[PDB]
Write a protein that binds this DNA or RNA. Structure first.
Lengths: 120, 183, 124, 106, 110, 174, 187
RNA sequence: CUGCCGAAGUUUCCCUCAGGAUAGCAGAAACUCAGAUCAGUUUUAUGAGUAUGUAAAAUGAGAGUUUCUAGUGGGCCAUUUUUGGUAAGCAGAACUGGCGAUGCGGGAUGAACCGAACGUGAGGUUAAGGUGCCGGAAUGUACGCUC
RNA sequence: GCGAAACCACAGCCUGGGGGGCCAGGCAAAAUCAGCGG
RNA sequence: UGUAUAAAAAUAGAGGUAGGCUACUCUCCUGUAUCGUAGAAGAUGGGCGAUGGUUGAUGAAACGGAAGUGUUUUAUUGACUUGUCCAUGAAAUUCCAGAAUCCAUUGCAUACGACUUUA
């Protein structure tokens, strides 16, 4: 059979990928982001020089399959706070922005148009 | 037996306090602090005598007395005049490159039997490393506590080892030369 | 270890029928049995273990194996009585003891006593 | 506030039982404070009540009381044995009881 | 319940008891000897007061008539000088008894 | 609780043996009746005098002459084991002769798991001379300058209450 | 016997504290334990580890690893947790990590019959449950230590304010002339 | 349906065959002595080889008889010797009990282990077993050994 | 839409001890659909 | 049915004490403590003494995130103000009781449910 670790082979409970593990914080480093979310569109193939030191294919031409993922710029709409607790990370509070993009309002509503758009 | 007493004559030092099973002994050289909760013992400091007493103790606890007495002697001599550990280098074919960083607290050794590893040793605090120019390959290990200096010497000795070869043919390595006080 | 089993140290018996009576160690039979006595006629000399007693600070000089009469002479000479009571440890025990044999009327007067003590609450 | 409570609290521990047989005829009561078998000699004979409630408003009170008597000391630690008019139900194991000071002996 | 009183006379098993009515408002009453907590407070003069006028028929069921108030007042008259003489007794009789928490009835005596 | 028992008895006189000899024993027993049983066991195994031809003339109990005087006792005993013979000689320091034997029963059944029937007491003697003492701990206990803190500090004052579940403060125990 | 009590678990023995606690729960008392990390077990540290790797080896169970979950397992073995008498006694026992805020303002009592010092011969090997579990799969050893230090700062600061306050009432106590009558009644 | 009584579970023989037996145990009726008549008992006296049998005071009990009429003649467990045996089990009898017809407490659980024989209930008190918690009952006392 | 029969003491979670019912443990949330072990 | 009480640390030791890192002295050896405690279930008044205490409503300000279940500084308020001393009343209770789904769409999904869309 396949890997025992990936068991059980049940369908994912999330439609979209969830980042369970994040890079460790470092106050010495400047503020920077860690994750992105785009959309997979398709793939093509590209021709690229292979500058691999010590390899037999060093400083020459190699063909590599590539994938194309469109990543339109997001809109930062809010921030959340997390507290390290003896029970793990706990959500302390959450603050948002004023003019939420209309697509975000679609996320909160299963039937947006029928709803009176009372979110936030 | 119900009692087992050990006596210590305090040398010059400055302070030999036994405050809360913690000898924060200060000598003319400096101050060192060690824990004493490892064993349950009566340690009295009075005049020029320190009394270590076992009451109704087993031989297992009795053996701790002389060990503590040997221990207590170590730093009190260290804080008075210090301790120096002389290190000698022996190489067969490939000369060994030794560098000292942060005034010798970290020692990197290079070119060991043809191997190309910059073996780095961050020596434990309280011990620093110096290279003696009076005699070549002579390395001085100065500190105020034998167990720390010796452990660093043991560590530098074990990282300076040979693998899957014959010991009686290869002679390169680092080994203990001798001990002594700073003065 | 200020509490030190020494020939002639005063001891205070905390278990057995002689609980609360003072007495002095006379001779060390072994690390689990000891011989104690007191001039007080209510306390006959007997061989008492170390489990029922707690050692006290006061120590009076006493030659080993002294008879009760000599011990009484030594105690009276060294005024150990009212020297134990000088300690703040002692003063609490009868304070607990005096409260033991109170009655209802004594308790009420105490309520009057403490209430008149608290009413001041005068602090600058 | 503290102008009441002329009784002594207790707990209905269990039935006086063998290892594998409960004898519901007599219960076990631990008076809050009793600490010896000689101590329980004081509480022997007193009257002990178990005060519970129910939805029915009998005579203008949801509160009911089941009477009982301390009968004899139980064990070496100061629990007693009680014989109530109605055997206390098995669901009151651990519930609270009141050993009122009467009938007195002083 | 919980009202400290003074016993007037012994009437077989029950006790003819009352507190100073001006103090605790306790009328002369019968109380069984099993429902009494006798205290060790100093004794009160009761020999001088009249007690012979108390019988089980007198207390038995046949709006309180006046002379029943009067003789109690007379008993108070013979009892007030004593409680006035001994300090703290008058208010102690007025005081109500209760069990403060953390108290062992067997140990603390009365 | 054992007692000292001076047990004296002799065999039943007859025409062959008109005047039996009075044997004497200083043996320990919890009651008078056990003293007789140990007596017959001690003597029959040794002198071979039958039970039915023996009568006992006097049972007396010996109170300790000077109980208040501390003493050191020498105790010769014979261990019975898988082998069944061991000349063991223990020494105990205490105040009462009976108390020393009690401890000897305490130690023999603790250190060596002995049994009262198996162990037969050989001789109990006083050791009046410190030089006559042979045990270092007793010798150390006999020194002029004895001094030691009360061992098992917790055993002193223990907890000192009736049922003190949930004490409100930590115990000093010092 | 208060309705709710808090048992500080620092220096208590896991087995002997649980047996005391399990009985109190069956008596109906709502017992809450705090500072379950600093519990103790008789036996050197590596021994108690191996007896725990047997527990993890036992598998089909749910080897709960947090120190509170270790103690709760200990109590669950001294209750009749199959029956509704013990099933309703288990839910009163609240064992926590360190001291949550709703309990750090409450007086914490200690069990004399199960303290480490009164029950272990001096020098005997023993292990701390908090350290043990942090080497079995617990992951919150460091955070509780940091949080406990912070509360110690506030609690110690609280005492100093209270210490001065009682000192004022200590200094003004002798001003009462009834102290002589207090002495006569031994109070 | 309730009540009362209540076994043997084995000899004896006969018997080609299966059995038949007499006896014992369990009963029912008819008749003697108020007995020194019996006893799963021990003494007294022995005689012979610490044991053995025998006859002749202690203790308890009312002991008897002739007549018929059922049921039964399996086995299991443990002790004594015991002769034959050996890596080691064993193998064989004679003997003694109890289970077999029997619930109950304890031994976590149990055919033989430890206690105990059962009308229906009340109180008292025990046995064996036990008193850290589950679990009724000392997180008792004392003296020791063990990491 | 029509529509059975076999079969049925009672039922149905596993480890260990004496199997599914006993003892001690582990656990323990309805109703159901589909493939499929014992 | 007083739902009264928050340092820590160690038990072969801690804390406090005043001065200039401490000398020295003191406390510990239990909570059998400390705090609160009357009133026909808490009445009506009268004085004497002190600027207090207790609360209810507040005006709040500050603090508390580990599960903040609250704490404090408090200005405020009008009560109650046993602090102490006096007078009136009890009683025959006469012995305990706005959203989401379906219908509809989509196909990133799909045995059927379900899931991702749209409407």
């Amino acid at each position: 059979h396949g890997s025992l670790g990936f068991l059980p082979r049940k369908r994912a409970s999330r439609q979209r990928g969830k980042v369970k593990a994040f890079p460790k914080d470092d106050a010495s480093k400047p503020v920077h982001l860690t994750a992105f979310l785009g959309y997979k569109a398709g793939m093509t193939h590209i021709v690229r020089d292979l500058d691999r030191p010590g390899s037999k294919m060093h400083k020459r031409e190699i063909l590599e399959a590539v994938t194309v993922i469109e990543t339109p710029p997001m809109v930062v709409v809010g921030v959340v706070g997390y507290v390290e607790t003896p029970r793990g990370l706990r959500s302390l509070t959450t603050v948002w922005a004023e003019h939420l993009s209309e697509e975000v309002k679609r996320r909160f509503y299963k039937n947006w148009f029928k709803s009176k758009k009372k979110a936030f | 037996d119900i009692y087992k007493d050990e006596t210590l004559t305090i040398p010059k030092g400055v302070t030999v306090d036994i405050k809360a099973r913690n000898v924060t002994v200060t000598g003319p050289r400096g101050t060192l602090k060690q824990n004493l909760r490892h064993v349950d013992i009566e340690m009295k400091k009075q005049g020029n005598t320190i009394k270590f007493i076992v009451w109704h103790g087993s031989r297992k606890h009795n053996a701790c007395i002389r060990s503590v007495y040997s221990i207590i002697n170590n730093m009190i001599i260290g804080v008075t005049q210090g301790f120096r550990y002389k290190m000698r280098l022996v190489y067969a074919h490939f000369p060994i490159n030794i560098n000292l960083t942060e005034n010798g607290t970290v020692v990197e050794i290079r070119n060991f039997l043809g191997e190309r590893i910059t073996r780095v040793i961050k020596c434990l605090p309280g011990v620093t490393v110096s290279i003696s120019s009076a005699v070549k390959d002579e390395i001085i290990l100065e500190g105020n506590s034998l167990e720390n200096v010796s452990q660093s010497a043991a560590n530098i000795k074990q990282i300076c080892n040979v693998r899957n070869k014959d010991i009686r043919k290869f002679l390169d390595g680092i080994y203990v030369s001798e001990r002594g006080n700073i003065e | 270890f200020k509490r030190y089993v020494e020939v002639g140290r005063v001891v205070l018996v905390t278990k057995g029928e002689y609980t609360g009576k003072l007495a002095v160690i006379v001779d060390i039979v072994d690390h689990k049995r000891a011989l104690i006595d007191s001039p007080c006629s209510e306390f006959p000399r007997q061989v008492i273990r170390y489990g029922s007693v707690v050692l006290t600070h006061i120590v009076m000089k006493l030659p080993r194996g002294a008879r009760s009469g000599i011990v009484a002479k030594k105690w009276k000479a060294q005024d150990v009585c009212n020297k134990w009571a000088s300690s703040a440890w002692a003063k609490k025990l009868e304070a607990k003891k005096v409260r033991s044999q109170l009655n209802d009327f004594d308790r009420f007067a105490v309520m009057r006593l403490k209430k008149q003590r608290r009413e001041q609450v005068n602090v600058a | 506030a503290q102008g009441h409570r002329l009784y002594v609290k207790a707990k209905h521990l269990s039935f006086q039982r063998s290892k594998h047989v409960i004898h519901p005829g007599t219960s076990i009561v631990k008076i809050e404070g009793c600490d010896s078998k000689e101590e329980a000699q004081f509480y022997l004979g007193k009257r002990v009540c178990y005060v519970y409630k129910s939805s029915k408003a009998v005579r203008g009170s949801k509160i009911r009381v089941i009477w009982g008597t301390i009968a004899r000391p139980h064990g070496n630690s100061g629990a007693v044995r009680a014989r109530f008019v109605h055997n206390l139900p098995a669901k009151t194991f651990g519930s609270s009881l009141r050993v009122m000071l009467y009938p007195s002996n002083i | 319940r919980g009202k400290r009183v003074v016993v007037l006379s012994q009437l077989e098993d029950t006790l003819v008891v009352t507190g100073p009515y001006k103090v605790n408002g306790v009328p002369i009453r019968r109380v069984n000897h099993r429902y009494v907590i006798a205290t060790s407070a100093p004794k009160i003069d009761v020999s001088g007061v009249s007690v012979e006028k108390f019988t089980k028929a007198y207390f038995a069921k046949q709006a309180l008539p006046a002379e029943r108030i009067a003789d109690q007042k007379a008993v108070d008259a013979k009892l007030l000088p004593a409680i006035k003489a001994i300090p703290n007794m008058k208010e102690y009789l007025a005081a109500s008894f209760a069990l403060s928490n953390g108290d062992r009835p067997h140990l603390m005596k009365f | 609780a054992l007692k000292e028992y001076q047990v004296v008895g002799r065999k039943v006189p007859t025409e062959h043996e008109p005047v039996p000899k009075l044997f004497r024993m200083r043996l320990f027993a919890p009651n008078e009746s056990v003293a007789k049983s140990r007596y017959w066991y001690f003597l029959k195994m040794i002198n071979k005098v039958k039970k039915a031809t023996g009568e006992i003339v006097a049972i007396n109990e010996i109170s300790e002459p000077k109980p208040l005087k501390a003493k050191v006792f020498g105790i010769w005993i014979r261990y019975d084991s898988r082998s069944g013979t061991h000349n063991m000689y223990k020494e105990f320091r205490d105040t009462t002769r009976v108390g020393a034997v009690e401890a000897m029963y305490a130690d023999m059944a603790a250190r060596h798991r002995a049994r009262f029937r198996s162990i037969r007491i050989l001789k109990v003697v006083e050791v009046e001379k410190k030089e006559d003492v042979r045990r270092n701990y007793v010798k150390q206990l006999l020194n002029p300058h004895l001094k030691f803190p009360l061992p098992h500090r917790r055993t002193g004052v223990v907890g000192l209450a009736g049922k003190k579940v949930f004490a409100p403060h930590r115990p000093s125990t010092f | 016997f208060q309705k709710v009590v808090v048992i500080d678990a620092k220096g208590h023995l896991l087995g002997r504290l649980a047996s005391v606690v399990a009985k109190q729960l069956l008596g109906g008392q709502k017992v809450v334990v705090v500072r379950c990390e600093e519990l103790n077990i008789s036996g050197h540290f590596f021994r108690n580890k191996l007896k725990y790797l047997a527990y993890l080896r036992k598998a089909c169970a749910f080897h709960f690893r947090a120190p509170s979950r270790i103690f709760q397992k200990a109590v669950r073995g001294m209750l009749p947790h199959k029956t509704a008498r013990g099933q309703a006694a288990l839910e009163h026992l609240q064992a926590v990590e360190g001291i949550p805020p709703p309990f750090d303002k409450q007086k914490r009592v200690v069990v004399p019959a199960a303290l480490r010092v009164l029950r272990l011969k001096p020098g005997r090997k023993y292990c701390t449950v908090g350290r043990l579990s942090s080497e079995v799969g617990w992951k919150y050893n460091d955070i509780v230590a940091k949080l406990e230090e912070r509360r110690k700062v506030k609690s110690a600061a609280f005492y100093q304010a209270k210490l001065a306050k009682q000192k004022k009432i200590a200094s003004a106590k002798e001003a009462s002339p009834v102290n002589q009558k207090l002495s006569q009644f031994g109070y």
